[PDB]
Amino acid sequence: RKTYTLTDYLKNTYRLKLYSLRWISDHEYLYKQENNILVFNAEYGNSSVFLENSTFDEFGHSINDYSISPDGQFILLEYNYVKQWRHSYTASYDIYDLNKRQLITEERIPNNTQWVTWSPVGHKLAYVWNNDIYVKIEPNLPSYRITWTGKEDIIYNGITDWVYEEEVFSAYSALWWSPNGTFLAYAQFNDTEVPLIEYSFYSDESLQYPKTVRVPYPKAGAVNPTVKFFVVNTDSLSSVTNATSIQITAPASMLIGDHYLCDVTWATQERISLQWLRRIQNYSVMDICDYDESSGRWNCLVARQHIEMSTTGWVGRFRPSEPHFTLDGNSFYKIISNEEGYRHICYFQIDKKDCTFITKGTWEVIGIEALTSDYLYYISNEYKGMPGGRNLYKIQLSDYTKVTCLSCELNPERCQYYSVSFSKEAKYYQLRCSGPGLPLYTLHSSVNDKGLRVLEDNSALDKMLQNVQMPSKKLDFIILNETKFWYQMILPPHFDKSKKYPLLLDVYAGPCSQKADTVFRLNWATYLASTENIIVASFDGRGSGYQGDKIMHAINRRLGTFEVEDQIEAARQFSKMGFVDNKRIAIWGWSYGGYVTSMVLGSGSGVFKCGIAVAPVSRWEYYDSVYTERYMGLPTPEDNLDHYRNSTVMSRAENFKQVEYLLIHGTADDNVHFQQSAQISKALVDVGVDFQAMWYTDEDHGIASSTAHQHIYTHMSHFIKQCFS
Amino acid sequence: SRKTYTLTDYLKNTYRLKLYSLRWISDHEYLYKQENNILVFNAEYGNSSVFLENSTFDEFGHSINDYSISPDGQFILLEYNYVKQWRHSYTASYDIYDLNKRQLITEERIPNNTQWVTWSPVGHKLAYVWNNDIYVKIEPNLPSYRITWTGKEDIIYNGITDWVYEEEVFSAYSALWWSPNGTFLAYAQFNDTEVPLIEYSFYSDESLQYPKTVRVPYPKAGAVNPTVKFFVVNTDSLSSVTNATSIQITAPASMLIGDHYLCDVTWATQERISLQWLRRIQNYSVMDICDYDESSGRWNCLVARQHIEMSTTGWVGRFRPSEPHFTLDGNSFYKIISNEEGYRHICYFQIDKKDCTFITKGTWEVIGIEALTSDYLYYISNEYKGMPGGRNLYKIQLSDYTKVTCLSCELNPERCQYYSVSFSKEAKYYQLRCSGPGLPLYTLHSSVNDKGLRVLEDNSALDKMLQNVQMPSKKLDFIILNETKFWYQMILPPHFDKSKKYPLLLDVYAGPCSQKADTVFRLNWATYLASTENIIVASFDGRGSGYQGDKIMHAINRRLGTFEVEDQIEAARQFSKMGFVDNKRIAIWGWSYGGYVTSMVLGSGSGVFKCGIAVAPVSRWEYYDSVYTERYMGLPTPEDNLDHYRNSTVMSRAENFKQVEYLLIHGTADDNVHFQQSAQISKALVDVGVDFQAMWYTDEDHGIASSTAHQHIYTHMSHFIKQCFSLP
Ligand SMILES: CC(C)(C)OC[C@@H]1C(=O)NCCN1C(=O)C[C@H](N)Cc1cc(F)c(F)cc1F
Ligand SMILES: CC(C)(C)OC[C@@H]1C(=O)NCCN1C(=O)C[C@H](N)Cc1cc(F)c(F)cc1F
């Protein structure tokens, strides 16, 4: 009866099986079989080989990924993959003509391409090379150069810079096809005056001299990149004259100061929706711009604007939600925080200001998943009032009282956390259950909500897990100021509540974050409970999301206060539970969780014995502007410079004499720069506090390389076991 | 004797060694700082006098870092805003104070951001370097004359050295050399146009939002080196012409065939300057004595005055060809060179004669020439009692080299076995500086009879404090390996009992031509480990160490990381077989070169060592600068010695680190041994999955000498040593 060991987690012994499918039409999806790609008929479950690996085993390159054209007449081959940031990367591409059954060797896609994408229909092709946009009406024909101002580290056409990739759009891409591929909208970011963050990269041992990486990176209060938006007609590309792009400008209420482009969504074939967001991220405006044939220009009627603001904090969770327009584009549904601070779906009209909420309650709609003529499919945490749960719902557009949950009752014993993937027209949908039981994948029919087939049930994994002493998970809540605050505990096998165990507080506690959910996980905490009999707990206090703006906006303009104090208060109640050794309580966290961990260890509460901080934030003036300023405003005396200086971990170095501290950070961290940890170590030296440290050469914010990953979790294990004796 | 020497005592500097730093201003007088007030002493009778009261500048507005009085005693340079650059370079602000008027200058002042200042040997002329250019002030209050115009940041250095020359060649920031009487100003010019830049982050105070990137021209092994030119300008002509002409002195033809260095500048007379050049392959150097042609105003270097100093079994010199010591007429000089037996002694040269004659000989070496008179030549050596780790002052008679007398051997034989000396102007008096094995002792002497005039400082106050302290003892002895004496030292804990088993810490450096076992008395981290933690701190000078003959120093030639590393392991086994060493508790730590050796030792698989600490270590020799590395390893090309470059990396031994506890420490702002080197060590240990302890120090250089970091590193290393030795 072995236990889940550290080797199991580091070597991925027990692996969850997925069912990652991509919908091709309203009733077909592609699936990978390790040797080929199969086309599945959603209605009957039969399949047929769409493309076998014996088609590119002669290529001479390692196939990184494939991209079928919407009409299934070409495929895009990705190779020479080179990662950049969280989403950005670079690769080489080769289009394979499914009709000629051979590669396209004429007018090939250039090497070092930054982003490629088909049109929504047909086989048009837009790609970004050297920060300039190109369009191919045909894969074999020459490409049409759309932009000419592309310049590395300054001008970005069709691609996002660093801050927009990480904080706004969560993608390298800045291209938006029209529904039928006629128009191609894109954004232009300009980092001319944006200060560059510089750090050393050491590379392989052969490199005699280290290289200096420089990235345009606006820290809190620095000069942000400017943005422009354009739309070009891809049906009239002139082979003789240059392409003519039409610029859509932001509303007057946004040009008064610094602002952002935070959302782009096409309504109809000639109507596109833009959402702008002031640098003070509590005021946003949606523009609905239509095309005018007689003038070849895009106009955004003032009467069709839509303001979305907040007085308790920022607008949106991390950005204003995306709209879902109706068939005629004259109406749309989108998630906005209601009057009491609970985010729900509001029915909008293109012409009028007032919207009408179609959902209500002391819970939140996580996201709108699909929209049809009669139904609106969304995910929420309404079932059993558990904020850590996720279920799929359908609300009738003609009668808001007819709401139906499509996943609540399928298997309430093993499934409480759901995601979904709909077909092209939402005729079928795949449900992705991920807890508390083993993940489960099912295929359903939208017309009657009947379960067609079981795609993946992890029955093979369930069998192996029966021969290992696996830990349990306890999801509950405690009361703070007459408010429910949820927590979770990874409990060791054979848990005895009369026995006493060491407790480790696994923390993140970022704004709109959630560490207490019903998701089933096989992670480092699994090993700590199964093998080391350690209770690893997580707590969602003030600042956590999916529980209303009263809890989420509580940390507005005062990061590093309530969410830090609540972690201490929660661990304080944990120590008085009888099964927790109050002399052996630790706390560790990554990224924002490293900041909270360091602020807790420097709080002088005396509750924690030791703690680990991995790639932590130490001084909010060091992190990027879009994220920091969203919760802290500007670091100016006339704004919020007080909390900026009052919430550093360096100012608490003196209180680090009570605890054992392990500080870890990667030298190539483009996100939370090594500077942050270098200033923490320097402050502890100035006050004479001893501590443990560890850098990782050329590792980024993830420290995700195979060898480094195993090394850090091995090093942290020794630190924890040594602190618990 | 109840209290031990605690770690706190070392970090807080409870027991301070008393010093006596004097500055000879004339033939019989020197300056001395009593209590912020500069005193002038008469060596003949000891009576003093006030030269600058302590309140003269306590109302200056700035904290004075150091003073510099003109040789004629009419002015005094006051530098403030001192900011250390490299080991010797620094930037500061300066002010000239007129002594004949007791006022500041306030007119045509020395510009801010001045990189170097220096007086003329006589008078009160002034030459300084600003924005990589040279300026000369005839009078401290009159406008200055610009000598160079090619000065360019990080590209052209005029009057100052670049990073390599400062660290590896001249051991000084200054590249200026006044003529003896001050008529001529000889300077060097360095061009780092194509020299690659080392780049690393500097974070500064936490108020700085964006980390700063430091960029320094740093030629690593094999990279392109800086080029050098030499010039001489006549400062007496600055007044009558608008742009004085600087006469260039080119190097001999035997140096222009390839890359070379300028390794020594030494004036001989008022119109005779000698330059020593060195090929990039540092086994061939050439001295070039040049005279001033009063007729044509040029400098000519007669081929018959050349002197070739080479080596057939390694590099030439210790760290560089030694400097010559000319007589008054400048027609002959004495110089330290390696003899046919490989022992460095003093040779007597004539300006024309290619052959010299050695005046000293034996299985021992001369450390340096101190003073030269018409009668005697004073030098320091380790001849006494055949102890390579001892230092004594000798006096050899010029008219009969068989008449050699030791001036410090028998002064205090039990208390003093390590000596340095500071002679007066014409060597009429000298101060003997004793530094071990007993407490430091300073004495003044008259060179007429070498009579002990008086005791300037005897550390009597410090002696009484150490009476009620359990200080450690020191054993300086040797072992015989392959029929050769190799010396070692041990800091033995108090009440040392050979019937007991003690833990052993092996303090290592073992760089080429270095010495860790000597007679110097020290109050350092080793004193605490022995006095309080009962740990024996041992050091061993194996193959590669200096002051013992070329057969030992040149042993590791082109083989760094081999003989010196293995000799350290063998010394540990030798110490374990002595009886009083616990075999299961032997550690080894080292700084800089010692960190490299420590890492190579811990990655050797010897099984001798349980743990080890490496501070600012070298990882591979292709990461270190050219002039130092190539001197011992040649060029990292396949045709010469690339194989030994790649074979002696610590990364290549990463697998063996699974058998030891490893602590790696390095400062992020290390300009000497770049953080890159420790960054490659850790990344290699991660690639093979071996756990280890790490510690970076933000914005600390190769010394990690900031008050707070210094206390932090020795506190951190103490915990690691005590836990590895199971020490409570
Ligand atoms: C990216 C992620 C988690 C996968 O989810 C996206 C999520 C989201 O909801 N919208 C867009 C972006 N996003 C964020 O969380 C942005 C933050 N920069 C994440 C973050 C916060 C820190 F405090 C910190 F120190 C480092 C750090 F990286
Ligand atoms: C500077 C010192 C000690 C005070 O003595 C001067 C001494 C000398 O004798 N002549 C001139 C220069 N010099 C040297 O030792 C030069 C070396 N760069 C020192 C050194 C060696 C390393 F292997 C290493 F990793 C780092 C490092 F700094």
mmCIF file with all atom_site columns, N, CA and C and ligand atoms in Angstrom, chain A residues 86-87 162 165-170 317-319 508 510-512 546 590-593 595 615-617 620 623-624 627 630-631 671-672 676 701, ligand 1:
data_model
loop_
_atom_site.group_PDB
_atom_site.id
_atom_site.type_symbol
_atom_site.label_atom_id
_atom_site.label_alt_id
_atom_site.label_comp_id
_atom_site.label_asym_id
_atom_site.label_entity_id
_atom_site.label_seq_id
_atom_site.pdbx_PDB_ins_code
_atom_site.Cartn_x
_atom_site.Cartn_y
_atom_site.Cartn_z
_atom_site.occupancy
_atom_site.B_iso_or_equiv
_atom_site.pdbx_formal_charge
_atom_site.auth_seq_id
_atom_site.auth_comp_id
_atom_site.auth_asym_id
_atom_site.auth_atom_id
_atom_site.pdbx_PDB_model_num
ATOM   1   N N   . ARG A 1 86  ? 4.294   34.216 -21.861 1.00 0.00 ? 86  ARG A N   1
ATOM   2   C CA  . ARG A 1 86  ? 3.270   33.269 -21.425 1.00 0.00 ? 86  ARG A CA  1
ATOM   3   C C   . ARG A 1 86  ? 2.503   32.689 -22.608 1.00 0.00 ? 86  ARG A C   1
ATOM   4   N N   . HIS A 1 87  ? 2.211   33.512 -23.614 1.00 0.00 ? 87  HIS A N   1
ATOM   5   C CA  . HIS A 1 87  ? 1.497   33.063 -24.801 1.00 0.00 ? 87  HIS A CA  1
ATOM   6   C C   . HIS A 1 87  ? 2.290   33.213 -26.091 1.00 0.00 ? 87  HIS A C   1
ATOM   7   N N   . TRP A 1 162 ? 4.452   43.176 -24.547 1.00 0.00 ? 162 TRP A N   1
ATOM   8   C CA  . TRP A 1 162 ? 4.513   42.336 -23.353 1.00 0.00 ? 162 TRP A CA  1
ATOM   9   C C   . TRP A 1 162 ? 3.291   42.544 -22.466 1.00 0.00 ? 162 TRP A C   1
ATOM   10  N N   . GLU A 1 165 ? -0.060  41.317 -23.842 1.00 0.00 ? 165 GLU A N   1
ATOM   11  C CA  . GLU A 1 165 ? -0.132  39.861 -23.913 1.00 0.00 ? 165 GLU A CA  1
ATOM   12  C C   . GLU A 1 165 ? -0.448  39.260 -22.551 1.00 0.00 ? 165 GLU A C   1
ATOM   13  N N   . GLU A 1 166 ? 0.163   39.795 -21.494 1.00 0.00 ? 166 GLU A N   1
ATOM   14  C CA  . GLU A 1 166 ? 0.033   39.202 -20.170 1.00 0.00 ? 166 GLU A CA  1
ATOM   15  C C   . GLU A 1 166 ? -1.246  39.641 -19.468 1.00 0.00 ? 166 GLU A C   1
ATOM   16  N N   . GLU A 1 167 ? -1.637  40.905 -19.625 1.00 0.00 ? 167 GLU A N   1
ATOM   17  C CA  . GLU A 1 167 ? -2.654  41.497 -18.765 1.00 0.00 ? 167 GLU A CA  1
ATOM   18  C C   . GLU A 1 167 ? -3.990  41.751 -19.445 1.00 0.00 ? 167 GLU A C   1
ATOM   19  N N   . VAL A 1 168 ? -4.005  42.042 -20.745 1.00 0.00 ? 168 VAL A N   1
ATOM   20  C CA  . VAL A 1 168 ? -5.233  42.465 -21.409 1.00 0.00 ? 168 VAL A CA  1
ATOM   21  C C   . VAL A 1 168 ? -5.863  41.322 -22.197 1.00 0.00 ? 168 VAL A C   1
ATOM   22  N N   . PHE A 1 169 ? -5.206  40.900 -23.278 1.00 0.00 ? 169 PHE A N   1
ATOM   23  C CA  . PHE A 1 169 ? -5.796  39.945 -24.207 1.00 0.00 ? 169 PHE A CA  1
ATOM   24  C C   . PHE A 1 169 ? -5.410  38.496 -23.934 1.00 0.00 ? 169 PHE A C   1
ATOM   25  N N   . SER A 1 170 ? -4.403  38.247 -23.099 1.00 0.00 ? 170 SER A N   1
ATOM   26  C CA  . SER A 1 170 ? -3.956  36.885 -22.804 1.00 0.00 ? 170 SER A CA  1
ATOM   27  C C   . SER A 1 170 ? -3.649  36.124 -24.091 1.00 0.00 ? 170 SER A C   1
ATOM   28  N N   . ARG A 1 317 ? -13.574 41.595 -13.923 1.00 0.00 ? 317 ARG A N   1
ATOM   29  C CA  . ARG A 1 317 ? -12.753 40.751 -13.061 1.00 0.00 ? 317 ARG A CA  1
ATOM   30  C C   . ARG A 1 317 ? -11.271 41.053 -13.269 1.00 0.00 ? 317 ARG A C   1
ATOM   31  N N   . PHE A 1 318 ? -10.769 40.794 -14.476 1.00 0.00 ? 318 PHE A N   1
ATOM   32  C CA  . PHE A 1 318 ? -9.484  41.307 -14.926 1.00 0.00 ? 318 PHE A CA  1
ATOM   33  C C   . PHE A 1 318 ? -9.614  42.220 -16.134 1.00 0.00 ? 318 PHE A C   1
ATOM   34  N N   . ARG A 1 319 ? -10.773 42.235 -16.784 1.00 0.00 ? 319 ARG A N   1
ATOM   35  C CA  . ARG A 1 319 ? -11.088 43.128 -17.888 1.00 0.00 ? 319 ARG A CA  1
ATOM   36  C C   . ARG A 1 319 ? -12.598 43.137 -18.059 1.00 0.00 ? 319 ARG A C   1
ATOM   37  N N   . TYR A 1 508 ? -2.329  31.849 -2.578  1.00 0.00 ? 508 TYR A N   1
ATOM   38  C CA  . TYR A 1 508 ? -2.129  32.736 -3.717  1.00 0.00 ? 508 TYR A CA  1
ATOM   39  C C   . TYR A 1 508 ? -2.766  34.081 -3.393  1.00 0.00 ? 508 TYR A C   1
ATOM   40  N N   . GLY A 1 510 ? -4.503  36.347 -4.849  1.00 0.00 ? 510 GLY A N   1
ATOM   41  C CA  . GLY A 1 510 ? -4.558  37.482 -5.738  1.00 0.00 ? 510 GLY A CA  1
ATOM   42  C C   . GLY A 1 510 ? -5.978  37.988 -5.899  1.00 0.00 ? 510 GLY A C   1
ATOM   43  N N   . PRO A 1 511 ? -6.133  39.214 -6.394  1.00 0.00 ? 511 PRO A N   1
ATOM   44  C CA  . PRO A 1 511 ? -7.483  39.741 -6.628  1.00 0.00 ? 511 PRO A CA  1
ATOM   45  C C   . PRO A 1 511 ? -8.250  38.868 -7.613  1.00 0.00 ? 511 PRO A C   1
ATOM   46  N N   . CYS A 1 512 ? -9.442  38.439 -7.197  1.00 0.00 ? 512 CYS A N   1
ATOM   47  C CA  . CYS A 1 512 ? -10.319 37.609 -8.022  1.00 0.00 ? 512 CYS A CA  1
ATOM   48  C C   . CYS A 1 512 ? -9.723  36.220 -8.240  1.00 0.00 ? 512 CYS A C   1
ATOM   49  N N   . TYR A 1 546 ? -15.503 35.594 -7.458  1.00 0.00 ? 546 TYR A N   1
ATOM   50  C CA  . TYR A 1 546 ? -16.673 34.739 -7.664  1.00 0.00 ? 546 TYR A CA  1
ATOM   51  C C   . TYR A 1 546 ? -17.621 34.743 -6.467  1.00 0.00 ? 546 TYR A C   1
ATOM   52  N N   . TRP A 1 590 ? 3.475   31.028 -4.570  1.00 0.00 ? 590 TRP A N   1
ATOM   53  C CA  . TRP A 1 590 ? 4.148   31.301 -5.830  1.00 0.00 ? 590 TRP A CA  1
ATOM   54  C C   . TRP A 1 590 ? 3.560   32.559 -6.455  1.00 0.00 ? 590 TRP A C   1
ATOM   55  N N   . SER A 1 591 ? 4.428   33.416 -6.994  1.00 0.00 ? 591 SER A N   1
ATOM   56  C CA  . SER A 1 591 ? 4.006   34.638 -7.686  1.00 0.00 ? 591 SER A CA  1
ATOM   57  C C   . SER A 1 591 ? 3.294   35.529 -6.675  1.00 0.00 ? 591 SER A C   1
ATOM   58  N N   . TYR A 1 592 ? 2.019   35.881 -6.874  1.00 0.00 ? 592 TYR A N   1
ATOM   59  C CA  . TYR A 1 592 ? 1.312   36.668 -5.872  1.00 0.00 ? 592 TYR A CA  1
ATOM   60  C C   . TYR A 1 592 ? 1.289   35.951 -4.532  1.00 0.00 ? 592 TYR A C   1
ATOM   61  N N   . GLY A 1 593 ? 1.239   34.617 -4.552  1.00 0.00 ? 593 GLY A N   1
ATOM   62  C CA  . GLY A 1 593 ? 1.291   33.863 -3.314  1.00 0.00 ? 593 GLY A CA  1
ATOM   63  C C   . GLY A 1 593 ? 2.624   33.993 -2.610  1.00 0.00 ? 593 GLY A C   1
ATOM   64  N N   . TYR A 1 595 ? 4.303   36.910 -2.631  1.00 0.00 ? 595 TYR A N   1
ATOM   65  C CA  . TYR A 1 595 ? 4.162   38.206 -1.971  1.00 0.00 ? 595 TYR A CA  1
ATOM   66  C C   . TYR A 1 595 ? 3.391   38.075 -0.661  1.00 0.00 ? 595 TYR A C   1
ATOM   67  N N   . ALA A 1 615 ? 9.413   33.292 -6.624  1.00 0.00 ? 615 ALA A N   1
ATOM   68  C CA  . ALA A 1 615 ? 9.203   34.386 -7.566  1.00 0.00 ? 615 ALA A CA  1
ATOM   69  C C   . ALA A 1 615 ? 8.173   35.394 -7.044  1.00 0.00 ? 615 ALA A C   1
ATOM   70  N N   . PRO A 1 616 ? 8.400   35.969 -5.869  1.00 0.00 ? 616 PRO A N   1
ATOM   71  C CA  . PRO A 1 616 ? 7.401   36.846 -5.261  1.00 0.00 ? 616 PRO A CA  1
ATOM   72  C C   . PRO A 1 616 ? 7.515   38.287 -5.736  1.00 0.00 ? 616 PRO A C   1
ATOM   73  N N   . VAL A 1 617 ? 6.395   38.988 -5.642  1.00 0.00 ? 617 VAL A N   1
ATOM   74  C CA  . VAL A 1 617 ? 6.403   40.440 -5.735  1.00 0.00 ? 617 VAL A CA  1
ATOM   75  C C   . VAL A 1 617 ? 6.828   41.003 -4.386  1.00 0.00 ? 617 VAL A C   1
ATOM   76  N N   . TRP A 1 620 ? 5.219   46.935 -5.263  1.00 0.00 ? 620 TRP A N   1
ATOM   77  C CA  . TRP A 1 620 ? 4.310   47.020 -6.402  1.00 0.00 ? 620 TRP A CA  1
ATOM   78  C C   . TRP A 1 620 ? 4.790   47.996 -7.465  1.00 0.00 ? 620 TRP A C   1
ATOM   79  N N   . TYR A 1 623 ? 6.200   45.885 -10.470 1.00 0.00 ? 623 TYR A N   1
ATOM   80  C CA  . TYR A 1 623 ? 5.401   45.095 -11.393 1.00 0.00 ? 623 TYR A CA  1
ATOM   81  C C   . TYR A 1 623 ? 4.766   45.989 -12.460 1.00 0.00 ? 623 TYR A C   1
ATOM   82  N N   . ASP A 1 624 ? 4.231   45.351 -13.501 1.00 0.00 ? 624 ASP A N   1
ATOM   83  C CA  . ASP A 1 624 ? 3.724   46.092 -14.647 1.00 0.00 ? 624 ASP A CA  1
ATOM   84  C C   . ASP A 1 624 ? 2.508   46.929 -14.259 1.00 0.00 ? 624 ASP A C   1
ATOM   85  N N   . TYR A 1 627 ? -1.705  45.624 -14.519 1.00 0.00 ? 627 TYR A N   1
ATOM   86  C CA  . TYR A 1 627 ? -2.166  44.831 -13.383 1.00 0.00 ? 627 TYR A CA  1
ATOM   87  C C   . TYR A 1 627 ? -2.124  45.637 -12.089 1.00 0.00 ? 627 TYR A C   1
ATOM   88  N N   . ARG A 1 630 ? -4.466  48.654 -11.749 1.00 0.00 ? 630 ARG A N   1
ATOM   89  C CA  . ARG A 1 630 ? -5.867  48.256 -11.691 1.00 0.00 ? 630 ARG A CA  1
ATOM   90  C C   . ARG A 1 630 ? -6.352  48.129 -10.253 1.00 0.00 ? 630 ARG A C   1
ATOM   91  N N   . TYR A 1 631 ? -5.463  47.746 -9.334  1.00 0.00 ? 631 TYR A N   1
ATOM   92  C CA  . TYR A 1 631 ? -5.819  47.555 -7.938  1.00 0.00 ? 631 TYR A CA  1
ATOM   93  C C   . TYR A 1 631 ? -5.214  48.601 -7.014  1.00 0.00 ? 631 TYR A C   1
ATOM   94  N N   . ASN A 1 671 ? 8.473   38.212 -15.949 1.00 0.00 ? 671 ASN A N   1
ATOM   95  C CA  . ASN A 1 671 ? 7.189   38.619 -15.374 1.00 0.00 ? 671 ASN A CA  1
ATOM   96  C C   . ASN A 1 671 ? 7.433   39.335 -14.048 1.00 0.00 ? 671 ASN A C   1
ATOM   97  N N   . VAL A 1 672 ? 7.791   38.578 -13.014 1.00 0.00 ? 672 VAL A N   1
ATOM   98  C CA  . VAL A 1 672 ? 8.192   39.137 -11.730 1.00 0.00 ? 672 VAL A CA  1
ATOM   99  C C   . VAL A 1 672 ? 9.716   39.135 -11.735 1.00 0.00 ? 672 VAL A C   1
ATOM   100 N N   . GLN A 1 676 ? 12.920  41.911 -7.844  1.00 0.00 ? 676 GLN A N   1
ATOM   101 C CA  . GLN A 1 676 ? 12.046  41.883 -6.675  1.00 0.00 ? 676 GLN A CA  1
ATOM   102 C C   . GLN A 1 676 ? 12.668  41.078 -5.539  1.00 0.00 ? 676 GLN A C   1
ATOM   103 N N   . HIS A 1 701 ? 9.273   32.915 -14.933 1.00 0.00 ? 701 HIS A N   1
ATOM   104 C CA  . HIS A 1 701 ? 8.333   32.962 -13.822 1.00 0.00 ? 701 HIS A CA  1
ATOM   105 C C   . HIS A 1 701 ? 7.763   31.591 -13.491 1.00 0.00 ? 701 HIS A C   1
HETATM 106 C C1  . LIG C 2 .   ? -2.300  34.283 -16.348 1.00 0.00 ? 1   LIG C C1  1
HETATM 107 C C2  . LIG C 2 .   ? -3.323  33.310 -15.784 1.00 0.00 ? 1   LIG C C2  1
HETATM 108 C C3  . LIG C 2 .   ? -3.006  33.128 -14.276 1.00 0.00 ? 1   LIG C C3  1
HETATM 109 C C4  . LIG C 2 .   ? -3.164  31.971 -16.492 1.00 0.00 ? 1   LIG C C4  1
HETATM 110 O O1  . LIG C 2 .   ? -4.693  33.733 -15.896 1.00 0.00 ? 1   LIG C O1  1
HETATM 111 C C5  . LIG C 2 .   ? -5.037  34.940 -16.597 1.00 0.00 ? 1   LIG C C5  1
HETATM 112 C C6  . LIG C 2 .   ? -5.347  36.025 -15.542 1.00 0.00 ? 1   LIG C C6  1
HETATM 113 C C7  . LIG C 2 .   ? -6.687  36.635 -15.830 1.00 0.00 ? 1   LIG C C7  1
HETATM 114 O O2  . LIG C 2 .   ? -7.645  36.308 -15.214 1.00 0.00 ? 1   LIG C O2  1
HETATM 115 N N1  . LIG C 2 .   ? -6.778  37.654 -16.875 1.00 0.00 ? 1   LIG C N1  1
HETATM 116 C C8  . LIG C 2 .   ? -5.586  38.045 -17.648 1.00 0.00 ? 1   LIG C C8  1
HETATM 117 C C9  . LIG C 2 .   ? -4.227  37.818 -16.918 1.00 0.00 ? 1   LIG C C9  1
HETATM 118 N N2  . LIG C 2 .   ? -4.372  37.099 -15.647 1.00 0.00 ? 1   LIG C N2  1
HETATM 119 C C10 . LIG C 2 .   ? -3.532  37.467 -14.460 1.00 0.00 ? 1   LIG C C10 1
HETATM 120 O O3  . LIG C 2 .   ? -3.677  36.888 -13.444 1.00 0.00 ? 1   LIG C O3  1
HETATM 121 C C11 . LIG C 2 .   ? -2.506  38.635 -14.625 1.00 0.00 ? 1   LIG C C11 1
HETATM 122 C C12 . LIG C 2 .   ? -1.373  38.690 -13.566 1.00 0.00 ? 1   LIG C C12 1
HETATM 123 N N3  . LIG C 2 .   ? -0.260  39.322 -14.215 1.00 0.00 ? 1   LIG C N3  1
HETATM 124 C C13 . LIG C 2 .   ? -0.900  37.333 -13.005 1.00 0.00 ? 1   LIG C C13 1
HETATM 125 C C14 . LIG C 2 .   ? 0.208   37.707 -11.975 1.00 0.00 ? 1   LIG C C14 1
HETATM 126 C C15 . LIG C 2 .   ? -0.150  38.393 -10.817 1.00 0.00 ? 1   LIG C C15 1
HETATM 127 C C16 . LIG C 2 .   ? 0.828   38.751 -9.890  1.00 0.00 ? 1   LIG C C16 1
HETATM 128 F F1  . LIG C 2 .   ? 0.482   39.413 -8.764  1.00 0.00 ? 1   LIG C F1  1
HETATM 129 C C17 . LIG C 2 .   ? 2.158   38.424 -10.127 1.00 0.00 ? 1   LIG C C17 1
HETATM 130 F F2  . LIG C 2 .   ? 3.134   38.766 -9.228  1.00 0.00 ? 1   LIG C F2  1
HETATM 131 C C18 . LIG C 2 .   ? 2.513   37.744 -11.285 1.00 0.00 ? 1   LIG C C18 1
HETATM 132 C C19 . LIG C 2 .   ? 1.538   37.387 -12.211 1.00 0.00 ? 1   LIG C C19 1
HETATM 133 F F3  . LIG C 2 .   ? 1.920   36.719 -13.339 1.00 0.00 ? 1   LIG C F3  1
#
